[PDB]
Design an enzyme around this catalytic site. Sequence first.
Site, mmCIF file in Angstrom:
data_model
loop_
_atom_site.group_PDB
_atom_site.id
_atom_site.type_symbol
_atom_site.label_atom_id
_atom_site.label_comp_id
_atom_site.label_asym_id
_atom_site.label_seq_id
_atom_site.Cartn_x
_atom_site.Cartn_y
_atom_site.Cartn_z
ATOM 1 N N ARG A 142 -2.812 -0.540 -6.683
ATOM 2 C CA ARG A 142 -1.552 -0.424 -5.948
ATOM 3 C C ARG A 142 -1.651 -1.257 -4.676
ATOM 4 O O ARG A 142 -1.686 -0.717 -3.563
ATOM 5 C CB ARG A 142 -1.233 1.037 -5.628
ATOM 6 N N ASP A 147 -3.177 8.607 1.878
ATOM 7 C CA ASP A 147 -2.977 8.050 0.550
ATOM 8 C C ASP A 147 -2.499 6.607 0.663
ATOM 9 O O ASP A 147 -1.919 6.195 1.671
ATOM 10 C CB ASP A 147 -1.970 8.887 -0.244
ATOM 11 N N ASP A 172 -0.212 5.135 -1.203
ATOM 12 C CA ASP A 172 1.197 4.948 -1.529
ATOM 13 C C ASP A 172 2.087 5.906 -0.745
ATOM 14 O O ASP A 172 2.790 6.733 -1.334
ATOM 15 C CB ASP A 172 1.424 5.115 -3.038
ATOM 16 N N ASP A 228 -9.123 19.006 -2.549
ATOM 17 C CA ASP A 228 -8.668 19.416 -1.225
ATOM 18 C C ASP A 228 -8.688 20.933 -1.070
ATOM 19 O O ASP A 228 -8.991 21.440 0.017
ATOM 20 C CB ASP A 228 -7.268 18.857 -0.941
ATOM 21 N N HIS A 239 6.076 10.665 0.528
ATOM 22 C CA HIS A 239 5.272 10.513 -0.679
ATOM 23 C C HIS A 239 5.996 11.214 -1.820
ATOM 24 O O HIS A 239 6.813 12.111 -1.597
ATOM 25 C CB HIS A 239 3.862 11.087 -0.491
HETATM 26 MG MG MG Z 1 -0.486 9.111 -4.553
#
Ligand code: MG
Lengths: 624, 623, 623
Positions: free
Chosen positions: B171, B256, B258, B371, B395
């Site tokens: 990405r 993250d 993205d 997490d 997100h």
């Molecule tokens: Mg993601």
Amino acid sequence: ETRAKSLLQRIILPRPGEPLDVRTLYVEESATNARRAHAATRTSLSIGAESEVSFCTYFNALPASYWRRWSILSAVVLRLELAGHGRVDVYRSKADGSRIHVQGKEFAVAPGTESVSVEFETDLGPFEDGGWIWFDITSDTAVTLLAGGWYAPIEAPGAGTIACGMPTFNRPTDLVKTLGALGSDPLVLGQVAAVIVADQGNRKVVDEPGFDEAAAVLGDRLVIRDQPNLGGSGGYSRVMYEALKNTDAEYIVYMDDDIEIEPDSILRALAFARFAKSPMLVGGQMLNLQERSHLHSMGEVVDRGIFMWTSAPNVEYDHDFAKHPLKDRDNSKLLHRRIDVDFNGWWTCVIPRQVAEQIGQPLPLFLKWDDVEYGLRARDHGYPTVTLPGAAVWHMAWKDDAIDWQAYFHLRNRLVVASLHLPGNGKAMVVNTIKATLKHLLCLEYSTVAIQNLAIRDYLAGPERLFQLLPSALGAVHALRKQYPDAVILPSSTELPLASHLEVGAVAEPANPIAKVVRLAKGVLHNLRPAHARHHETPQLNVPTLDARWFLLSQVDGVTVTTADGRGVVYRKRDPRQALGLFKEAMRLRKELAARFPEMQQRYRAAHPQLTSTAAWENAFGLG
Amino acid sequence: ETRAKSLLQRIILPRPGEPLDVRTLYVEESATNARRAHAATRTSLSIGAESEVSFCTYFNALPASYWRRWSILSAVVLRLELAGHGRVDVYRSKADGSRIHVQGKEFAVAPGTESVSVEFETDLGPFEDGGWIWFDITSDTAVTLLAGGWYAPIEAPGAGTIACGMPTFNRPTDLVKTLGALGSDPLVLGQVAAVIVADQGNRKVVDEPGFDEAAAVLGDRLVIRDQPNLGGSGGYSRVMYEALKNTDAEYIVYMDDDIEIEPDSILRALAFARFAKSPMLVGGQMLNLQERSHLHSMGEVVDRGIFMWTSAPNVEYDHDFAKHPLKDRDNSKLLHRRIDVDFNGWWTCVIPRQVAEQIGQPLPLFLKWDDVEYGLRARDHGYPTVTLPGAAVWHMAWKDDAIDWQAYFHLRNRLVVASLHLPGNGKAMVVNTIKATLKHLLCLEYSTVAIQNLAIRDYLAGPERLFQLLPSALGAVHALRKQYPDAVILPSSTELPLASHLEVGAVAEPANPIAKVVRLAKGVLHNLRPAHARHHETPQLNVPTLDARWFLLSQVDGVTVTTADGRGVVYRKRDPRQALGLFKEAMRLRKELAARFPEMQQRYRAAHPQLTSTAAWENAFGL
Amino acid sequence: ETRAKSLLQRIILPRPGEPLDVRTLYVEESATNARRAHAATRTSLSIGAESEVSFCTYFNALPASYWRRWSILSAVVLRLELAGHGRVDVYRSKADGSRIHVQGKEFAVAPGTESVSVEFETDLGPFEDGGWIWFDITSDTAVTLLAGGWYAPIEAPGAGTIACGMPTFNRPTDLVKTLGALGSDPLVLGQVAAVIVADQGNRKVVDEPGFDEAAAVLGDRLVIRDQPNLGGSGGYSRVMYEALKNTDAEYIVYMDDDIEIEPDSILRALAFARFAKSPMLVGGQMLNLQERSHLHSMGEVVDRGIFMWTSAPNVEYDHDFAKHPLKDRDNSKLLHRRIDVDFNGWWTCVIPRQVAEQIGQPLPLFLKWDDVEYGLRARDHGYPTVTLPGAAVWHMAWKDDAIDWQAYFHLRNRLVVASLHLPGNGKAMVVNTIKATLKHLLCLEYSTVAIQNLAIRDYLAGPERLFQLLPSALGAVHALRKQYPDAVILPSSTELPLASHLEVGAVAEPANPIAKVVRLAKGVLHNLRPAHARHHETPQLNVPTLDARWFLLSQVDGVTVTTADGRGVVYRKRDPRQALGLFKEAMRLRKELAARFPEMQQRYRAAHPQLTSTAAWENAFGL
Ligand SMILES: [Mg+2]
Ligand SMILES: [Mg+2]
Ligand SMILES: [Mg+2]
């Protein structure tokens, strides 16, 4: 050639930068208007062309039912000074909020001049059970209301001098603002002959910054007296004593030290008291100081069955004018009914000098029921009380007043005033207090039961102790409360171990009533079993204020309950032995009360003249 | 003379030409205003005369309950720079959303000057169970808010240096956008000491257009490492490793690759971590990237009965602020309650260097339940996790994450963490998974049951296999799923013959529960008879996503079901033999699991320091 | 550099002084805008500062599901030319109406230049079950959209030449307006090679004022042909014959002489027919001419159990975009699904030349059930039919089409087409017609049954009489209807004596269904007793159109019923012997139909090739 003779109510308008929700108390602007009405001054308004502004609001509409029921006026006169081309339409309403067109006039300024007068005169005929009178302004060009107000077509009787009075206790920052707002309006200052302050705290308002300017504005009117903390009863009694001894005013105006004063409300209450048929108490309403567009109550009465102060008929607490305007017949119909009250609070109340000199001084009750008894005494002496809509001040509404130390004064004095006015044997009141004790015990509120037992004991001791308990009851109540875990307040729930959630079952409100009954049975059975000390050091749940009801507290052994204002928590712990002991003591005291109630009635009614005497209060203040 | 000492939260405003529904996250303009407020910059606003603008919004209202419960601050300070003539009214709220007017002021610019200062100071007293603090501006003339923000009356402890880290995988465009947004704010760059990237995919971000400019803006902070695809677990582990080894920052910021970064959220989380009473994790919330005006979740907890992550108490998913503003006491009263969470997602999370060096590295779980375990470990070591409102990043939200390959990683690790924080025998979790397998088998989702059996088998293999299954389980799950027809995605339903609509009866959900029970009985009786192969070749129905429920898949033999995002269909076919066999295998595996659960608990609690050590992860990184 | 190649659909805008409710089909302006958007032309828009305009409308939104299911395109390119400073945001939607943000770009005119290009490219991936693609424009300063449209990233196959055709009958003014509208757009005329008119009435279009200008604009494309009134079937058949014989166009465009044409809809349908995977009939939708903001139907199918045309699945008639816009997920969710149809009307329909030459000419049915049979034949020959949203024309919808003469052609041709496409014995259709006859006899509509019996008789006469009944059935039906009192229309109810209200009991619709049953029993008992002639000279009630239901008409002897359009009344009268005789004849004919149904099936299926031949129609046209 104007029919206007005496001003009764000015057309007041919001402040510069007033919030939109508070503006509804003054003007009801139409959403179709392409421009918001700009308020240049506090008595003028500027509306743009092709705009409609309705004055069917809480402050600018006239309660014609009240001026018909108690005033000697036969008609009211509306006068407006206008600039521009438009139309003014006067409407009235019936007792159910139905709008009725009364009159209408198209106005325009004559060429060569600058303003034009528009005047109406409407009879107070069709207002037997309720109704208001208001006017709307629909503009054709840029219209400006320069001045306006309601008038009586006859001169106001008497001189109209008033002596204001506020008891304060360690609130100098708010008392300075109150005095400044009292002296800000010159129309109000022209009627004030004295401003009496009774400082009962240690932080004197004289040592407060900003005091000297307001004091210089008030001039020699400001008179501050220092005395021990005798509560609201002692403070207002000192105010009345000073007003009747050293001032020549015609009306005593009880106020509070922590209120936001709208100065025209005082003039409205004064004009209403001056035009009354017979002498009468004219009190004002209360707007929520935190939600300034909310009217707390339209009026208060006292249920004579269980003897308890409650809302008057056709009255619901907390009315938001911003969400439900006065024109809304669905949610504001009850506002168009004339509200008959038994008493009025002392946040803003007008007592004629005749009534004060006749019925006497307030009772030495410190706090709570001190205004209800005065209203009832005035009514028994032939002087009624009216809570006038339109005249109001801003003050905080009512939290934990039935749990904390106040639960003492709320009960004891309740039994005192009941000794003076409750007709009958008073068994219904005793049953009400019994079920209240049951609720307090089921909710793990044991300090409340203890201080209420103390209140019953101090009441059964006779009226001869009322002046001795005036400066010493609060200390005993506080010392008794702070020995129970449910009264000691902590900074936060973090001061205790984390919530264990052990032995926790159904604590959510039941839906069907059979579930309510089975949960009440469960709670009784749970309170019958000995508690676990494990839950007396580590709490089970961190319960908020609204979640702390019977259906949750009657199934636990140890729980932290958050205080009303949200500044701390209290650790309530269930104890079957102490609960049963407090219940036995409360039942013993209530049986003795039911047995001795005629004796207490006789004794309190016999001692009432000595308790309201000027000499006894002079001895109480220290002026022996 | 000002009481301001530390900037905590800047009054931010929308972008030029911002969509109206997204503007509600910053300002709440009154409909009676004749002119819409114009935001000149992202930190200034210009409102016309006789207008009112409320800042009781998701980005400009201070969560006072959070700054009272976990911060050493006794009060907050609101400082505003204003031009014009108006009034500022500061309000607060209670746990139920009751508006309490705190303090008002009337401001005007003196002749000869250009601006005026309006400063308030309000204690954090009445915020035990919840409540916000905000301010409204009602203008008499044209009023321009030049700047404003919240301030702590004491200086911030420490240095406030942060090391951000994002694992990426094929990405590069979104990662370049994220790196550009990270270095756009000078106040954010002034606190960044390192920007760690863990490129695990073949398409490298260094070869992406637009990368060099963002890299030059970031400077020496940008550090890109390369390693095989070790999932999010391995990526964030490499980030924390590089941060604790080569950087001298005080906090690690998991992000993250993205996400659309709101820059001031980083500074808000940093200030909330620096003013904390004890060291703690300060995670950020997630706004829906597709519905940019929606907040996904106020917080997440884990139910210890069946041991499953879910929404915290007094939390509902997907809250639209454009439709339900913060002032709406009917549909937004739950946002005024202080939400206590157990963990926070790694889309934006602040971990102090002390906490990271004490509790260690994330578990080698690849995807899902990493997490959660890290938050629970921090909690056991004396460090709580707080999902701070107002500090959020955009997100994507959650689809088919319970049917596809993820159903493996979500179950296996669910057991792994269950061996670490589930008190008791854990029979409730096994019963929950049994009924979930029942639901899957009734919905013709046989590949999910197969991969869940595989997850149970890999979990019962022991922790020693974890580091062996970190770069190898994904291929096995894919190869297993590609053997079932319901896990093979076709381009469209046009690839299959036209829908026959033969032998299709009651498929629309009924309104009475008696009909629900009789339809469940019909489906049970139908899943017993041998299916007809005619419906395994020509589908019976072209069922969309929302219509694919139990009251339809249990009365059919072969149906094309459209995927969640709508980019294809899958051919689900009913087979009694295979369904019964998968059920028998799942029941045997769950019996063995319920029998060996204490053994697995001991094995996973003993090998925890080895799986969270630096040397094991170094061996895993290829180092 | 631009990926745009072929124009598929222009961003069109309303007319000068367009009504507000009609503007919703083009733009969805935000109510918070201080100024309404002004369209200086039909392709440009001018929005003021701080305003939002959403193009998620019926005309300016792309139906991505249809361009994904039936087109060879893999993506769509949105290109806009803008002046000013603002932002464009491209959104999409799922099959249920959930708005998903796709992309966004902030635009501003560079110094020196006047306009700036903004271009997006979105794949047609997530649209398997439905969805649209639109764009919103949020302004910062004054913004002007000069021109915009959707594009295909590949060139269009073929030339795109179209031959239009409109049958007419004594409607010269509307036909002249239609010709003017067809010739007003140059982009449409650039593709039109012929404009065929089949004048079947006495009043000719050539003698209508305003015809010469439209003829001069069209040029040598206009081809008018005179022929006897053969109905819609004959008119459209002559249009197709002329288009296939004397023109070299690639697509025939059936239109109606009395429609208001949106010129870009023609180009949209053409682009959809050209980029199609296989040859297909791309038909257009119908917006209500009387309520121009209403869409009549999203699609039409035919139920095969009773063989009757009806609305497609997830299609609700009459959708008001002014009240319920496309963004309303509560009242417009069904519009976000891809509608599969069985046929399409001939008010606007594109038929490829290959399909027309292969499957043949329309059947000689005069009126009704001709487009249905043509669509069914096309589908049987591998050519599907698709009703394309966004491409529509304005035309009147539907009244008394089930009671007047149209009840004849609708029933007979319902059987004929059934004989070609009804699987089974067709008993359900006969039962449906039986209960329809029962309803007609209860409502005192005796002429309807009298002509339905004639339709059943003429259908059983064989397909050899179809060409003979083409110019002779209408006169027979008219002469049979005008002999009944319920079919003769009077100018008003004042022509009869005033309503007596004698012997009028309960006539309001019952509440509980038991009351419905007892009222049906009362109505059955009332139709058994001899009718009083008193109520046949003086009517009992003056009943409006919506009040003339069974619960009122089954308890009366003589009632005036108002016609649908409200231009007159009919004196319905009840006669028990006449109703009984009509019922007996209907039952006899329907039993004969149910007995001889396979015979008629075979006969019509064998005669279909001869009835769709060019020679038979040349004989029918008098050539
Ligand atoms: Mg993601
Ligand atoms: Mg007070
Ligand atoms: Mg027509």
